[PDB]
Amino acid sequence: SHMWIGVISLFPEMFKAITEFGVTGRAVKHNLLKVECWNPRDFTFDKHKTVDDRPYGGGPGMLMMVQPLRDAIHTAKAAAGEGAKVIYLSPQGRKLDQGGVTELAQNQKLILVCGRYEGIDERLIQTEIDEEWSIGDYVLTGGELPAMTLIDAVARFIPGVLGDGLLDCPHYTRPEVLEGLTVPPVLMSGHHEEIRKWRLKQSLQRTWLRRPELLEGLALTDEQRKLLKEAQAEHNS
């Protein structure tokens, strides 16, 4: 169940960060993930290969020039064939979370449009973009890091790439004692069921202490209710 992702970007070499390294690098090498980039600069026709343009109404910044960006998008859509969802990365988009990742990962083909300067023409969003997505409520210099973030997150759902609403539990490895801090004995016990429950209780405790709002969205199992109650009682000494 491989995934094809088309990318529109003025800086396609940025995507080497995911295509050449680590788990995602391996996914690309093994043809589980295909990332293909089109650069608006290649679709310019003037001598200086101009990719920006002035905003109507004035303002300090520039926008992506429409014609090169539009042509790049059309070319990516033709390469993708039917069924590709076109996504624009911006702070105005739907905020990404793990549920959203799982939704996006159901697509066999995505096209990711990465804006630079002050963004892109609103009418291109109307005519060319299927969905707007944000990776978080903060502003970046370009849509490339958000696109790579999205790619990395969905790649984890592709079969062969890798080897429940709660924060992760603490993890420990060698040595047994590190600056006076010992590994919790239960993890040394070999008692698989005790270890499972300890890890689950830790996740529940950490979620409650750090991100209590996340618990509101969950229908806890009987076991989770019990372990959370235990953690909260211990916290209250």
Ligand X SMILES: NC(=O)c1ccc(N[C@@H]2CC[C@@H](O)C2)nc1
> Which of the listed partners (its own copies, ligand X, none) does 89 bind, with a CB threshold of 5 to 8 Å by partner kind?
ligand X
Q: Which is nearer to its own copies, 80 or 161 (CB)?
A: 161
Structure tokens at 64: 């992506």
Choosing from 27, 35, 65, 135, the residue that interacts with ligand X (CB under 6 A) is: 135
* Rounded CA separation 156/5 (Å): 14
Asked if residues 77 and 36 have their Cβ atoms less than 8 Å apart, the reply is: no
Query: Can you give the length of the chain in residues?
Result: 237
Place of tokens 């000494």: 237
Which of its own copies, ligand X, none does residue 31 bind (CB under 5 to 8 Å by kind)? none
* CB closest to ligand X, residue no: 115
H or E element at residue 8: strand 3-8
How many chain residues bind ligand X (CB under 6 A)? 16
Burial of 61 (0-12, 13-18, 19+ CB in 10 A): exposed
Non-local (6+) Cβ contacts of 98 within 8 A are 153
Per CB under 6 A, the segment of 47-55, 129-137, 178-186, 227-235 that binds ligand X is 129-137
Q: Does 169 bind ligand X (CB under 6 A)?
A: no
Tokens 């590994």 sit on residue = 183
Q: Do residues 5 and 35 touch, judged by C-beta distance below 8 A?
A: yes
22 makes contact, choosing from its own copies, ligand X, none, with CB < 5 to 8 Å by partner type, with its own copies
Minimal distance, residue 15 CB to its own copies, in Å: 8
Please indicate if the annotation marks 100 as binding a ligand: no
Least gap, CB of 168 to its own copies (angstroms): 6
Q: What is the DSSP letter of 40?
A: G
Could you tell me which stretch among 44-52, 68-76, 136-144, 198-206 binds ligand X (CB under 6 A)?
136-144
Q: Per the structure block, which two tokens stand in for 67?
A: 């014609």
Q: Is 88 flagged in the annotation as binding?
A: yes
> Does the protein bind ligand X through residue 210 (CB under 6 A)?
no
Residue 172 assigned as binding residue: no
Q: Which residues are annotated as a binding site?
A: 88, 115, 135-140
Binding-site positions for S-adenosyl-L-methionine: 88, 115, 135-140
